[PDB]
RNA sequence: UUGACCUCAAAUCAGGUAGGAGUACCCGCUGAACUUAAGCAUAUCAAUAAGCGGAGGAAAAGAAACCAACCGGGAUUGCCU
RNA sequence: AUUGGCGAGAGACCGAUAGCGAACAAGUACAGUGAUGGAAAGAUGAAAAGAACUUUGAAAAGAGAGUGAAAAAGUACGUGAAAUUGUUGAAAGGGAAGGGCAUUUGAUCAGACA
RNA sequence: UCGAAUUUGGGUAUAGGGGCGAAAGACUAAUCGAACCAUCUAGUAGCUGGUUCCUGCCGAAGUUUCCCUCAGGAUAGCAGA
RNA sequence: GUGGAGGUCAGUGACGAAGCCUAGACCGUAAGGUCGGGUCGAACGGCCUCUAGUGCAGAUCUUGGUGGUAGUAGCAAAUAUUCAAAUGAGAACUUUGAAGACUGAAGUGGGGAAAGGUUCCACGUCAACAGCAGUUGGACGUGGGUUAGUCGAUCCUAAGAG
RNA sequence: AAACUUUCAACAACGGAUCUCUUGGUUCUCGCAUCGAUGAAGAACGCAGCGAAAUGCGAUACGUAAUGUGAAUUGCAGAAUUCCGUGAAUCAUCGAAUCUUUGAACGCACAUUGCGCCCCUUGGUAUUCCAGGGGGCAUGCCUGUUUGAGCGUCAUUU
């Protein structure tokens, strides 16, 4: 009775969607994501899980802003606007 | 013999640069040599092909043919001469893809800019 | 399920929209390489886990 | 693991040593980089000569006191005796050591004469402007060997 | 066709505002068509034009508020330079070039002298 | 009655700063056991891994409460030894 | 100092079961309640010129044709081994088969004559 | 056995040398005389299995001594170079 | 005998390199070497040196592929089917009509909670799938469809969380 | 004698070894120092004339402004006024903008597209109710401003 018959009563989620990482690792009664630690300010991570670290670090994502810090620095953070020449 | 410290003879680095080259870079890669006449006519050896130029295929099966460049197919690294085409079984016609290095330029399509270019390289013009 | 949250009904909507065959015109593009849709899902084969 | 007539070895490789191996692959690198670093300092430094004037000094201990050896700086006594101040001798490429003390006359006259010859064999451009280009001798150590 | 930026930049603040409503009625109508026509690429250009007017209506009201702020302490944060959160913090040249009264007298009195060796 | 002082409060008070990320390298805290000893507890692995706090383009160290015992040397760091 | 980051030059390095797990819509697809786990998968041709048309077929297809330097390259696509399979040809077989030395017979072949 | 120490949904608490146990070392997600996940970790192994071309010449030992030694080592002996 | 490296033979090659096939030939005791033919399509070898991720039959070896088994075990619980017409290339299995039966309201009927997430509905449609079939489908393709002051949530408090 | 079994070969299967490839990996070296409340990194949902994904972007959505180039883009359609030109482009560059829902994540919550407060404004006969538009209200701490508390405590009133 521990096997197939009992599996029929599996129909209640222990985890739902984690606001901070959309992962279905948000424990309902515990109110905390087993993947990223929401709502704990610091994002959950360990040095024993280097894959899961890779699986999430900067650059696995849009980098909406960081994308451009390199180019901007390359030009000495230009305020202004380019002028004109000819041709 | 390379000598700068900012050229790379790396064969992998090159092929990547060519195939992944942006449109603006392929324009200059797709350069055709001017014809013997045109060369002494302009003091200039070759030029980035452009659309309404007039060209003679000096290589390949369509050796001898000539015509106007219909489209520069920068995506395909290939230029299409409207006059040099395949007919099919179902009669339908289809452009052949031609490469500017196997063409020769016979009558340029001159702009304000096309001239200033010829002069930027050190040419004279008619 | 049968009386859901908007978050869930929303996820299902985006789901539905991914359940379509390849737009055949893509098969024609230069250097095109995608043959079929390899992320096609079916409700009775792979459950989406919310 | 004891056998044969072999000398007992002491090969300390029982920590995670493979983690801390330093191969000086950049040996040629860092020499090229060190040469360029000096060629820039040379040019930044106007006709000034890359190093400062170092004193004579008798090396410590019963093993090295036979030899004489460049010390750090010139002591307040030698500087004065050679007729200039500490504060100024520094701007003239002379190294001064507030810590070294003078107990041996021989060394003392030696360094004070070393300062005479240094002063006599340099030229100090005016504060004004002119800047009468006079081309750098590069060391000073080489110029005034010990 | 399509709207041009330097041509908008001459129109009045309220000409431009009406241009937008012209392109919006325009757009809204094309969309009624697009569902009868198998394809309607026209819609792309009319929707890029809205974007272009809006950029201008915004570009103008901004360099308005810059200048009527230009040259004083305190101006909206989003007209202050971006740079780097830490570049923002760095000491300004002034509070950095600072030297103590005592040490100023030193740099003046004994400064690094330009000298050379030979004779 | 009126005005100070000390200490402590409140504001959607004027202006600012902190969090989080990353962490190869750097400053600390904390801290195993497998293992080796042909057993094993001291020891070893290791002042290592895992855990925690904090920085930079480097960090830290640094102008001697130093080394010496010499005819004395002369901030720190790093290499060869 | 630096198995991170930005930008560069390289190698007596690996060559798609190798090299990073990933040369590809790879930290994907898929598994797990979760922490986590985590693949496979590159190559027609110079060029689609990706086979008009005829015929048999319900269709898929077959058969002609046609393209091409080549379909002994047909989007199952370079070369296309092996195990294993069909067909054809040859041969042997009274409770395995295969092997050694030797010769008959059958098949097959080198060299040497001059 | 079947009207109660009854059955059962949802919510909720208890977490691994810990929980929970009308007590069987039972149950704690097909895992329980200590759950699952990753890491230390390529843990150690006097034990088991495997260890990839040809030819040529030479060619053994199961005995001595000491060993927490008796399925192992050191030592001598035999063997090659 | 293999991969890569220095030198050399101004070595072989699109008039066909490498590879693969071949009870065809030759050299070596052997590891192996050479040639013919066929397939093939872009590279490759000899000699002196250098170098190692350098040789497989085994490891209940790793990954992939393939057999004998074998057209075999099997496709037998849930009482059951039958006649005709229509459609269709094709009908034991689709649709319609007729008959025989079943569940027997503690349902094989009529709705919901959880869970799924479009399976619902229509049109088209059979390559795969539904361990016979298929013209049917919860399959494939293409579209349509979920309307609230009063039904729920939202509000309240419970153990508990914080 | 067939069949069948077996062996060899040719042709055809199966399978993907081999050979040759390589916009990838791996290692070495050189140069450089730039995330974030001015909202980062990450997440979610969206955005094209015809897109599921990858890439890119944010209701200005495979992009807007600017600058350089000087005529494409291309699977199909397409616009055509854009070709001696403030001008093509799925171009390069990028100094200006837009930047949904979130996230340290900040009015409160959040298995909820749940529920407050203030200010300006518009409509509804309205300072008070409803609705639309805009702009706001987290915490610790520093300097200062203002308003206060306490026989902690100094003086000053008659
Ligand atoms: Mg069971
Ligand atoms: Mg159990
Ligand atoms: Mg629970
Ligand atoms: Mg908690
Ligand atoms: Mg939080
Ligand atoms: Mg965080
Ligand atoms: Mg992160
Ligand atoms: Mg971001
Ligand atoms: Mg800038
Ligand atoms: Mg120009
Ligand atoms: Mg140059
Ligand atoms: Mg150029
Ligand atoms: Mg040029
Ligand atoms: Mg193109
Ligand atoms: Mg070409
Ligand atoms: Mg419901
Ligand atoms: Mg999952
Ligand atoms: Mg779920
Ligand atoms: Mg011995
Ligand atoms: Mg050591
Ligand atoms: Mg050890
Ligand atoms: Mg290094
Ligand atoms: Mg260096
Ligand atoms: Mg020096
Ligand atoms: Mg002395
Ligand atoms: Mg000494
Ligand atoms: Mg001057
Ligand atoms: Mg900033
Ligand atoms: Mg500021
Ligand atoms: Mg304030
Ligand atoms: Mg921090
Ligand atoms: Mg740390
Ligand atoms: Mg410790
Ligand atoms: Mg170990
Ligand atoms: Mg030990
Ligand atoms: Mg031990
Ligand atoms: Mg042991
Ligand atoms: Mg033990
Ligand atoms: Mg030790
Ligand atoms: Mg210790
Ligand atoms: Mg260590
Ligand atoms: Mg650590
Ligand atoms: Mg610094
Ligand atoms: Mg920094
Ligand atoms: Mg430095
Ligand atoms: Mg001192
Ligand atoms: Mg010292
Ligand atoms: Mg590096
Ligand atoms: Mg180099
Ligand atoms: Mg590189
Ligand atoms: Mg691989
Ligand atoms: Mg393999
Ligand atoms: Mg290998
Ligand atoms: Mg792999
Ligand atoms: Mg590739
Ligand atoms: Mg991939
Ligand atoms: Mg994962
Ligand atoms: Mg995944
Ligand atoms: Mg797959
Ligand atoms: Mg190929
Ligand atoms: Mg292939
Ligand atoms: Mg090809
Ligand atoms: Mg190809
Ligand atoms: Mg015909
Ligand atoms: Mg015919
Ligand atoms: Mg045919
Ligand atoms: Mg040929
Ligand atoms: Mg061929
Ligand atoms: Mg054919
Ligand atoms: Mg072929
Ligand atoms: Mg075909
Ligand atoms: Mg083939
Ligand atoms: Mg028998
Ligand atoms: Mg025989
Ligand atoms: Mg003869
Ligand atoms: Mg206990
Ligand atoms: Mg324990
Ligand atoms: Mg405990
Ligand atoms: Mg289990
Ligand atoms: Mg335990
Ligand atoms: Mg479990
Ligand atoms: Mg091992
Ligand atoms: Mg033993
Ligand atoms: Mg053992
Ligand atoms: Mg031998
Ligand atoms: Mg013998
Ligand atoms: Mg003993
Ligand atoms: Mg014993
Ligand atoms: Mg044994
Ligand atoms: Mg002995
Ligand atoms: Mg012997
Ligand atoms: Mg070799
Ligand atoms: Mg081959
Ligand atoms: Mg053959
Ligand atoms: Mg043969
Ligand atoms: Mg022969
Ligand atoms: Mg032979
Ligand atoms: Mg021979
Ligand atoms: Mg041959
Ligand atoms: Mg041949
Ligand atoms: Mg060949
Ligand atoms: Mg080829
Ligand atoms: Mg050679
Ligand atoms: Mg050799
Ligand atoms: Mg090996
Ligand atoms: Mg073997
Ligand atoms: Mg072998
Ligand atoms: Mg092998
Ligand atoms: Mg094998
Ligand atoms: Mg075997
Ligand atoms: Mg063997
Ligand atoms: Mg095997
Ligand atoms: Mg079988
Ligand atoms: Mg059968
Ligand atoms: Mg049977
Ligand atoms: Mg049975
Ligand atoms: Mg039955
Ligand atoms: Mg009955
Ligand atoms: Mg009929
Ligand atoms: Mg039936
Ligand atoms: Mg009947
Ligand atoms: Mg009936
Ligand atoms: Mg009945
Ligand atoms: Mg009833
Ligand atoms: Mg009954
Ligand atoms: Mg019922
Ligand atoms: Mg219902
Ligand atoms: Mg469902
Ligand atoms: Mg319905
Ligand atoms: Mg139907
Ligand atoms: Mg079928
Ligand atoms: Mg099915
Ligand atoms: Mg079936
Ligand atoms: Mg069938
Ligand atoms: Mg459907
Ligand atoms: Mg649908
Ligand atoms: Mg109600
Ligand atoms: Mg409400
Ligand atoms: Mg609390
Ligand atoms: Mg007969
Ligand atoms: Mg054979
Ligand atoms: Mg294959
Ligand atoms: Mg290969
Ligand atoms: Mg190739
Ligand atoms: Mg490389
Ligand atoms: Mg370099
Ligand atoms: Mg889309
Ligand atoms: Mg795109
Ligand atoms: Mg952009
Ligand atoms: Mg387009
Ligand atoms: Mg125009
Ligand atoms: Mg312009
Ligand atoms: Mg432009
Ligand atoms: Mg671009
Ligand atoms: Mg906006
Ligand atoms: Mg943006
Ligand atoms: Mg909050
Ligand atoms: Mg909200
Ligand atoms: Mg609420
Ligand atoms: Mg009003
Ligand atoms: Mg009113
Ligand atoms: Mg608002
Ligand atoms: Mg205050
Ligand atoms: Mg006050
Ligand atoms: Zn999370």
Swiss-Prot record, chain A:
Its main location: cytoplasm. Keywords: Cytoplasm, Metal-binding, Ribonucleoprotein, Ribosomal protein, RNA-binding, rRNA-binding, Zinc, Zinc-finger. It comes from Saccharomyces cerevisiae (strain ATCC 204508 / S288c) (Baker's yeast). Belongs to the eukaryotic ribosomal protein eL37 family. Component of the large ribosomal subunit (LSU). Mature yeast ribosomes consist of a small (40S) and a large (60S) subunit. The 40S small subunit contains 1 molecule of ribosomal RNA (18S rRNA) and 33 different proteins (encoded by 57 genes). The large 60S subunit contains 3 rRNA molecules (25S, 5.8S and 5S rRNA) and 46 different proteins (encoded by 81 genes). The gene is RPL37A. The lineage of its organism: Eukaryota, Fungi, Dikarya, Ascomycota, Saccharomycotina. It comes from the Eukaryota. A zinc finger (C4-type) spans 18-36. The keyword Ribonucleoprotein applies. Present with 21800 molecules/cell in log phase SD medium. There are 2 genes for eL37 in yeast. NCBIfam families: PRK04179.1. Gene3D superfamilies: 2.20.25.30. One of its GO terms (biological process) is cytoplasmic translation. InterPro entries: Ribosomal_eL37, Ribosomal_eL37/eL43, Ribosomal_eL37_CS, Ribosomal_zn-bd. Binds 1 zinc ion per subunit. Zn(2+) binds at residues 18, 21, 33, 36. It is found in: Cytoplasm. SUPFAM superfamilies: Zn-binding ribosomal proteins. This is Large ribosomal subunit protein eL37A. One of its GO terms (cellular component) is cytosolic large ribosomal subunit. Its cofactor is Zn(2+). GO terms for molecular function: RNA binding; rRNA binding; structural constituent of ribosome; zinc ion binding.
UniProtKB/Swiss-Prot annotation, chain B:
Gene3D superfamilies: 2.30.30.30. This is Large ribosomal subunit protein uL24A. The keyword Ribosomal protein applies. Component of the ribosome, a large ribonucleoprotein complex responsible for the synthesis of proteins in the cell. The small ribosomal subunit (SSU) binds messenger RNAs (mRNAs) and translates the encoded message by selecting cognate aminoacyl-transfer RNA (tRNA) molecules. The large subunit (LSU) contains the ribosomal catalytic site termed the peptidyl transferase center (PTC), which catalyzes the formation of peptide bonds, thereby polymerizing the amino acids delivered by tRNAs into a polypeptide chain. Component of the large ribosomal subunit (LSU). Mature yeast ribosomes consist of a small (40S) and a large (60S) subunit. The 40S small subunit contains 1 molecule of ribosomal RNA (18S rRNA) and 33 different proteins (encoded by 57 genes). The large 60S subunit contains 3 rRNA molecules (25S, 5.8S and 5S rRNA) and 46 different proteins (encoded by 81 genes). It comes from Saccharomyces cerevisiae (strain ATCC 204508 / S288c). GO terms for biological process: cytoplasmic translation; ribosomal large subunit biogenesis. GO terms for molecular function: RNA binding; structural constituent of ribosome. One of its GO terms (cellular component) is cytosol. Belongs to the universal ribosomal protein uL24 family. There are 2 genes for uL24 in yeast. PROSITE patterns: RIBOSOMAL_L24. Keywords: Cytoplasm, Ribonucleoprotein, Ribosomal protein.
Swiss-Prot record, chain C:
GO terms for cellular component: cytoplasm; cytosol; cytosolic large ribosomal subunit. Transmembrane segments: none annotated. Residues 1-21 are annotated as: Disordered. It is found in: Cytoplasm. The keyword Ribosomal protein applies. GO terms for biological process: cytoplasmic translation. Residues 6-19 have a biased composition (Basic residues). Keywords: Cytoplasm, Ribonucleoprotein, Ribosomal protein. GO terms for molecular function: structural constituent of ribosome. It comes from the Eukaryota. It holds the Pfam family Ribosomal_L39. Belongs to the eukaryotic ribosomal protein eL39 family. Component of the ribosome, a large ribonucleoprotein complex responsible for the synthesis of proteins in the cell. The small ribosomal subunit (SSU) binds messenger RNAs (mRNAs) and translates the encoded message by selecting cognate aminoacyl-transfer RNA (tRNA) molecules. The large subunit (LSU) contains the ribosomal catalytic site termed the peptidyl transferase center (PTC), which catalyzes the formation of peptide bonds, thereby polymerizing the amino acids delivered by tRNAs into a polypeptide chain. Component of the large ribosomal subunit (LSU). Mature yeast ribosomes consist of a small (40S) and a large (60S) subunit. The 40S small subunit contains 1 molecule of ribosomal RNA (18S rRNA) and 33 different proteins (encoded by 57 genes). The large 60S subunit contains 3 rRNA molecules (25S, 5.8S and 5S rRNA) and 46 different proteins (encoded by 81 genes). eL39 interacts with YIH1. This is Large ribosomal subunit protein eL39.
Swiss-Prot record, chain D:
GO terms for molecular function: RNA binding; structural constituent of ribosome. Its main location: cytoplasm. Keywords: Cytoplasm, Phosphoprotein, Ribonucleoprotein, Ribosomal protein. The keyword Endoplasmic reticulum does not apply. It is found in: Cytoplasm. One of its GO terms (biological process) is cytoplasmic translation. The keyword Ribosomal protein applies. The modification Phosphothreonine is found at residue 143. GO terms for cellular component: cytosol; cytosolic large ribosomal subunit. Transmembrane segments: none annotated. Component of the ribosome, a large ribonucleoprotein complex responsible for the synthesis of proteins in the cell. The small ribosomal subunit (SSU) binds messenger RNAs (mRNAs) and translates the encoded message by selecting cognate aminoacyl-transfer RNA (tRNA) molecules. The large subunit (LSU) contains the ribosomal catalytic site termed the peptidyl transferase center (PTC), which catalyzes the formation of peptide bonds, thereby polymerizing the amino acids delivered by tRNAs into a polypeptide chain. Belongs to the eukaryotic ribosomal protein eL13 family. Component of the large ribosomal subunit (LSU). Mature yeast ribosomes consist of a small (40S) and a large (60S) subunit. The 40S small subunit contains 1 molecule of ribosomal RNA (18S rRNA) and 33 different proteins (encoded by 57 genes). The large 60S subunit contains 3 rRNA molecules (25S, 5.8S and 5S rRNA) and 46 different proteins (encoded by 81 genes). Present with 133000 molecules/cell in log phase SD medium. This is Large ribosomal subunit protein eL13A. The gene is RPL13A.
